[PDB]
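Replying to the earlier thread about multi-chain prediction with a worked example.

Input:
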Amino acid sequence: SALGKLQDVVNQNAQALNTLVKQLSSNFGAISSVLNDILSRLDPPEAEV
Amino acid sequence: DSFVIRGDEVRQIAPGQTGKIADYNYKLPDDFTGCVIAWNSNNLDSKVG
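Result:
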């Protein structure tokens, strides 16, 4: 428990990277989270929306 | 531009909205900064047979 500050910084950076990669795979109010299924199963207007 | 279509095919002529006529005859992209005008012409363009 002595090496706390450096370990805390490393853990914070890892958690930030993980939550960023997780937010990339979010819906954000859409029907899915993948762009291919959206551009392939929707009409161009709703697709670009 | 001028063309003759039926009733159900009028709504298909719109920016972004696809269908049967706006795929091989007259396609309108999502940049149409004109304005569609249309009216009924079943009094001088139709004939028996």
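Chain B has no helices and no strands.

Feel free to reuse this layout for your own posts.
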